Design a protein around this ligand. Sequence first.
Ligand SMILES: O=C(O)C1=C[C@@H](O)[C@@H](O)[C@H](O)C1
Ligand SMILES: O=C(O)C[NH2+]CP(=O)(O)O
Length: 427
Amino acid sequence: MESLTLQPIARVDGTINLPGSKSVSNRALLLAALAHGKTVLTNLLDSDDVRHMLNALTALGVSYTLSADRTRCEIIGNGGPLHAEGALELFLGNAGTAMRPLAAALCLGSNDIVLTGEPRMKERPIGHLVDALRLGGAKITYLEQENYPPLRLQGGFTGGNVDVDGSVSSQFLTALLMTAPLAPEDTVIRIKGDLVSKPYIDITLNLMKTFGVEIENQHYQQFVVKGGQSYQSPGTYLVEGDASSASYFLAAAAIKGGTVKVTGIGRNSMQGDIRFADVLEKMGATICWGDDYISCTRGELNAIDMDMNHIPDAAMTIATAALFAKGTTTLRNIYNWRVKETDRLFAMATELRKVGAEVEEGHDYIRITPPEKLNFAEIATYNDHRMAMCFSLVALSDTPVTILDPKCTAKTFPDYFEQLARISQAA
Ligand SMILES: O=C(O)C1=C[C@@H](O)[C@@H](O)[C@H](O)C1
Ligand SMILES: O=C(O)C[NH2+]CP(=O)(O)O
């Protein structure tokens, strides 16, 4: 299969202009499609996950145009719920930010649509969202395994009292929040127990407000939504650079800098992953904050032991950065790593051991003891963009690393290796 071998990188230094945020991009596209008016999105991410959303919108009849680099998108809002019949199949790759929000949104009114995706997506849970949608009136059928895509959506979500489990995925609540305002009746969304990864709910509410809708958030335990609302185009909207994508570059400087500055995100960002910078600071790196940048400068690197549920995606970057830290690092409260692009606790533990680390794969945590020196390994990537990006950091040592299926980074960051190369220096 395809592979890329990264030569040892002596030092990193430079500036990277970040690709757009995947989380913001897919929310903005769906809201723009539902909204009245023309929305112009700039700094939109061009990656597999966004392409699947764009293709779904095209299939649903939404009109839009894209600039040459696909980062500027002019969307003609539909002025209401999207519709299709005949069990139209929408193929969503392995994009959770397309699958979960569309699973909910397409329950408005009548419809006959099928949502499916890659094999792994048929193994990523969606039952708790389906349960909630059904409580609100939706008719949903599991075409294969109960609790997983593919789903046949036949509409009917009118609102009412809806309970949802948010203990493993915040995306189920996000999907309900974006959908409820357009339902004919008011909706009260009750969180069954605890809610995981709260920052993504804040991103959803932030985007909804940009598109003209606000709801009543009762300490994240219950959300009161008024029905009969309409989303409205914000005119021109700038998509923040991706803070999760930024993690690799900031960590690279913490390990081998130099100073690396990422632009497109700053202290005012709505993304929870900007807090990844705080972790590097706790490890001994220096961080500088700007309006539209975050930079990291090499200091030292000490192991840490902390809960990472607030930044599950960027947290993976700490797992490989730990190979360069002094002491044993423990990342806790990351059970949900198991239900993402791959089971990341199993994958991270397996690949880290290949370069020499002693690793304890806990059920919901990972403990990493770095080796005195890293060794060469051919890293398996599990169709997971972040496995490829996290392990690229192994090359900030005296050993090269070979990454299998490097193009898997395209899920969120097609140009990843060219960007890492941009800040890689020989002297
Ligand atoms: O709502 C979102 O945008 C996301 C939430 C989390 O599940 C993340 O793990 C996922 O990558 C994106
Ligand atoms: O980006 C990540 O690290 C995990 N994404 C899961 P998805 O966006 O497919 O729901």
